[PDB]
Amino acid sequence: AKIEEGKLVIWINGDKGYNGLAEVGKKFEKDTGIKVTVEHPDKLEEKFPQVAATGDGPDIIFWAHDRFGGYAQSGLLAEITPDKAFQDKLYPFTWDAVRYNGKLIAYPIAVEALSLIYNKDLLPNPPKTWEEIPALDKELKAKGKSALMFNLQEPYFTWPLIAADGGYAFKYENKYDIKDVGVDNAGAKAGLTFLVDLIKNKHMNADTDYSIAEAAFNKGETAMTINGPWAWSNIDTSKVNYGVTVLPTFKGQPSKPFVGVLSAGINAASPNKELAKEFLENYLLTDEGLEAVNKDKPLGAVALKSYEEELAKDPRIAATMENAQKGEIMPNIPQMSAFWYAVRTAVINAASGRQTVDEALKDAQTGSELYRQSLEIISRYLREQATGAADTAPMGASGATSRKALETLRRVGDGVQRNHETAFQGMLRKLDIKNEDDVKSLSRVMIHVFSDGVTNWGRIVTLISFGAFVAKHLKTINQESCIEPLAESITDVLVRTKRDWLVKQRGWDGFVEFFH
Ligand SMILES: COc1cc(N2C[C@@H](C)n3c(c(CCCOc4cc(C)c(Cl)c(C)c4)c4ccc(Cl)c(-c5c(C)nn(C)c5C)c43)C2=O)c2c(cc(C(=O)O)n2C)c1OC
Ligand SMILES: OC[C@H]1O[C@H](O[C@H]2[C@H](O)[C@@H](O)[C@@H](O)O[C@@H]2CO)[C@H](O)[C@@H](O)[C@@H]1O
């Protein structure tokens, strides 16, 4: 659980040009004598947060920018401080994607969007609408072919259709109303229903994954796929005559892909930060570094202006950027992980018939909102307990649940602190909480005490009640500013460790019901 000094270990996804990246790594070694090892582990985006938390993991991690806010919030990423001469070399909007709480937390590499990829020998004129695909499949079935196959196991691929008629993740208005989540509105239902009808009508198969769709397209069995620039390499190898074009419309509106910026972050625990900065700035993020990677697997529209000027002339890149402009740049906020996990489950379940569309997307909504809803409740309870007066500000979206949960919490939590005063007092003294630093350390003890045994609402109340007990203390010793970080810490333990149980209860609505 310690990163070796004097070399660089890099993680990148197995669908990217890791062989090309290693070539850049060989050029680095040739100059510096430093060995660069490139790995592509399965589920690297899930592994990185676990291993980095213990001071382990790679020196550099590559992923789309959406995951990096969560990493940064957890303290896992070194701040990046390029000089102006280096910053000026990349498009300002790519830097924006890797900015979190005012600070740059990675190097942007390339802009990625999904496009429609089509076999020009089977389909000289690709469909402009989703709606015409059923009839097109019927035509192609008569030839022993099919219209469309794409990965149905990852929600990234289905999201453009879900968002077309009005589905959205976190509402953007001045900022991201994390409280306003749009995964179960009429637009999202209409899009996912269209997909589920395609499967029911035998135009697609719920089990199709990345590998199956890729093989089917690259063997000329299906006339269309939906994929990103990284996929073009393998299609070149297959010698399918393909084009890349704008995704189909749904209900007269453009498909709206979530746009990712492939980004390179530096592990906060790396003893090799200067090596990493040197590698990224002066080897990778150059014309020749990016070309080496791009020649292995296309990056998309790269962040480096000098090299993108060349790539932009490619009609596949123009198509990529057209789709991107119709879509939206992903948030990098910490709750994106939870959003993706919820929507993944919803798509799979609706596709398989395990849930209806309405059942599936309702669960997704609950799952995506759970962090913020929980924090509203816990923060307000903590602060009103500590100060003696309630917060007057409006709840917001799903404000009844919040209000009702806080009402219930007050009633059911009243007993608890009195009833367990002695044990709460004893635990308080052993913890010796004095400052914000102490608060940040509590996470481990807290997890431990809330571990094992059973899960029920009473125990959740006990968790939060001790929270309020600590908050009251923090206020009396003039550390009122520590209550909000205490609330965040309790929320994080709750929603992570109890996610599936919470969603099963219909979230905080279950709580209000249970103590009715
Ligand atoms: C093992 O299975 C259990 C355990 C519990 N309990 C009882 C005791 C151990 N307990 C519990 C909590 C809430 C979870 C942790 O809460 C926090 C802890 C820390 C360190 C922080 Cl900083 C914060 C903000 C919250 C307790 C919280 C405080 C104390 Cl002092 C105790 C406690 C008591 C009472 N006696 N002792 C010796 C201690 C250490 C806390 C906790 O989860 C269970 C259940 C089921 C329930 C229930 O139905 O209510 N409870 C409360 C359980 O499953 C069998
Ligand atoms: O499906 C959810 C998944 O979507 C995105 O991951 C993409 C990634 O951006 C692409 O570069 C490519 O590798 O395909 C992935 C989908 O399989 C998000 O970036 C990711 O965080 C999320 O889990």
Author numbering: -196 to -23, -21 to 320
Can I see the authors' text?
Myeloid cell leukemia 1 (Mcl-1) is a key regulator of the intrinsic apoptosis pathway. Overexpression of Mcl-1 is correlated with high tumor grade, poor survival, and both intrinsic and acquired resistance to cancer therapies. Due to the need to closely regulate apoptosis, Mcl-1 binds very tightly to the BH3-only family members. All members of the Bcl-2 family possess a conserved BH3 domain, which consists of an amphipathic α-helix containing four key hydrophobic residues (L210, L213, V216, and V220 in Mcl-1), which interact with four corresponding hydrophobic pockets (P1–P4) located on the anti-apoptotic Bcl-2 family proteins. Given this large protein–protein interface that defines the binding interaction between BH3-only and anti-apoptotic family members, it is often necessary for inhibitors to exhibit extremely tight binding affinities (subnanomolar) before demonstrating activity in cellular experiments.
While a combination of both an alkyl and an ether substituent at the 4- and 5-positions (15–17) did not show an increase in cellular potency, the 4,5-dimethoxy compound 18 showed a significant improvement, with an NCI-H929 GI50 of 37 nM, a ∼5-fold increase relative to compound 10. To understand the binding interactions between the Mcl-1 protein and the 2-carboxy-1H-indol-7-yl series, we obtained the X-ray co-crystal structure of compound 18 bound to Mcl-1. The binding mode was then compared to the previously reported co-crystal structure of compound 9.85 The overall binding pose is closely preserved in both compounds. The 3,5-dimethyl-4-chlorophenol sits deep in the Mcl-1 P2 pocket where it forms an edge-to-face π-stacking interaction with Phe270. Despite the different attachment position of the C–N amide-indole bond, the indole moiety in both 9 and 18 forms a cation-π interaction with Arg263. This key interaction partially accounts for the observation whereby introduction of electron donating groups on the indole headpiece improves the binding affinity of our inhibitors. Additionally, both 9 and 18 present the carboxylic acid moiety in a similar position to the Mcl-1 peptide, where it forms a hydrogen bonding interaction with Asn260. Finally, we observe a conformational change in the Mcl-1 protein loop region to accommodate the bulkier substituted indole moiety. This occurs in the region where the peptide backbone sits closer to the small molecule, positioning the 4-methoxy group of 18 within hydrogen bonding distance of Val258. In contrast, the ether substituent at the indole 5-position is directed parallel to the shelf region of the protein, which offers significant space and an ideal vector for further exploration.
